């Protein structure tokens, strides 16, 4: 089942660079939101939204 | 024939970066030139996108730099890329020169390449100093006036030259506007000098880490050495991204963020660290005119290095004594840069004098003696008469 994968993805270069660009789209967006979610959960209570909810409650 | 070999611009790009025959056995030290070209393009690009916001008055220089740091979008990135890529530029340049004077590529078919490289080194020291005196901090202004007061030690002509260079009577608004114009201008002379470096290389081909002829089996540039350059470019980008994002101010002095006040002296007027060995060579001998001419002799005494090497084998790869004395010279250069950061004090003045004597004696005294000794040792160990 590797011949079908090679035929539909890496045979012609146009679908190769199109796959690379669409993967760049979805990778950049989910990588950005995942790394900012981790960076804002590693600091809990130190961010401004947490301080604002703390002084609002 | 092919279109990449027929068209006139593409034939140049082909013959330089596609199928330029490089020797088959070059290691990772030969990628420092590609790294220097990339980092020069990085410096020029971030410099243009900072000079679109930098205003070069005396009332607006440091305020405009901290306006870049605080208000323009991603300006902290641009300023830290410039101020750290200059340090990385000089460290990769020091690696380039040390590779060149270790592997014997100052030798008989590329002495004009070595001389053009020394010209590039002088020009980039000059524009790096001008860029450091654009920002107008406390190290900046006083380092400028210290080395121009150094430059006024010429006997008949010196005060007239230094009050032509200042644009006045001390380092002020005309000096800072002058230094911004020159700090823009000189890297576009370095770009032409790097084009000259590439031509003077390409007429003869690169050396290999053995000394022997690369002309037997060579390798085209495109599918192999571009990817070796890609490995070292991504490693250099990783180390540069670390030094830009996680500790940006761990290289520069923590006194350049005080605004330039020409009344107070900060009691330690050291420059940025790549000028520290030449500053130690300067502060070695107590007189001043002799100090600046021995700093200039310390810079252009790399030109006597092709004419003073008497070894019949190219490079220190298959030598022992010259390997030992070359690493003595390198750690002496690092010690000289360490001495240039301290005050003129109790072992430091004698250590600076002895270190600059060992620096000046590696090129003039030590290397023809040990090269002659190694030649005679090779002959009397080989032949049996």
């Amino acid at each position: 089942s590797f011949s079908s994968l090679y035929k539909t993805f890496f045979k012609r270069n146009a679908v190769f660079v199109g796959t690379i660009f669409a993967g760049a789209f979805v990778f950049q967006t989910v990588f950005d939101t995942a790394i900012t979610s981790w960076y804002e959960n590693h600091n809990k209570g130190k961010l401004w939204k947490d301080v604002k909810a703390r002084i609002a409650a | 024939m092919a279109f990449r070999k027929s068209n006139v611009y593409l034939s140049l790009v082909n013959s330089y970066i596609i199928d330029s025959p490089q020797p088959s056995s070059i290691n990772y030290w030969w990628n420092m030139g590609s790294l220097l070209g990339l980092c020069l393009v990085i410096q020029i690009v971030t410099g243009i996108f900072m000079a679109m916001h930098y205003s070069s008055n005396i009332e607006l220089a440091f305020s405009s730099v901290e306006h870049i740091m605080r208000d323009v979008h991603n300006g902290y990135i641009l300023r830290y890329l410039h101020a750290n890529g200059a340090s990385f530029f000089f460290m990769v340049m020091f690696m380039h020169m040390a590779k060149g004077l270790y592997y014997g590529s100052y030798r008989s078919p590329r002495v004009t390449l070595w001389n053009v490289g020394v010209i590039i080194f002088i020009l980039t020291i000059a524009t790096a100093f001008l860029g450091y005196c654009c920002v107008y901090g406390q190290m900046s202004h006083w380092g400028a006036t210290v080395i121009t007061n150094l430059f006024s030690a010429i006997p008949f002509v010196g005060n007239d030259i230094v009050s032509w260079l200042w644009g006045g009577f001390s380092v002020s608004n005309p000096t800072i506007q002058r230094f911004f114009a020159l700090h823009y201008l000189v890297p576009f002379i370095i770009a032409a000098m790097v084009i000259m470096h590439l031509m003077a290389l390409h007429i003869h081909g690169s050396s290999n880490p053995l000394g022997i002829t690369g002309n037997l089996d060579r390798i085209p540039m495109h599918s192999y050495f571009i990817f070796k350059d890609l490995v070292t470019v991504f490693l250099f980008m990783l180390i540069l991204a670390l030094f830009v994002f996680y500790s940006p101010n761990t290289l520069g002095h923590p006194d350049n963020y005080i605004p330039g006040n020409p009344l107070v002296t900060p009691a330690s007027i050291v420059p940025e660290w790549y000028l520290l060995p030449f500053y130690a060579i300067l502060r070695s001998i107590p007189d001043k005119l002799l100090g600046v001419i021995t700093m200039f002799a310390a810079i252009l005494v790399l030109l006597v290095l092709p004419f003073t090497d008497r070894s019949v084998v190219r490079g220190n790869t298959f030598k022992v004594l010259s390997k030992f004395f070359f690493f003595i010279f390198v750690f002496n250069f690092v010690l000289l840069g360490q001495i240039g950061a301290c005050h003129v004090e109790v072992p430091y003045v004698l250590m600076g004098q002895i270190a600059t004597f060992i620096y000046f004696a590696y090129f003039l005294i030590i290397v023809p003696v040990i090269s002659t000794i190694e030649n005679v040792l090779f002959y009397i160990g080989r032949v049996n008469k």
């Binding site: 190769f16 | 208000d71 979008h73 991603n74 300006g75």
Partner: protein, 62 residues
Amino acid sequence: KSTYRTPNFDDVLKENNDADKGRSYAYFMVGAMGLLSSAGAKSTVETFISSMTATADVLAMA
């Protein structure tokens, strides 16, 4: 030694010289490098031309 007898390569070779499997593996690796470098080149270009937009004092006094 004859000039038709090749030296051994049986340590640097693989057991299954499939065309599609090895070609797909190599092209997936070069495509992953191209994907990461594409996202990086996009982000640094938009960094450089996001510097040239309106600075925060102009947006404040808008």
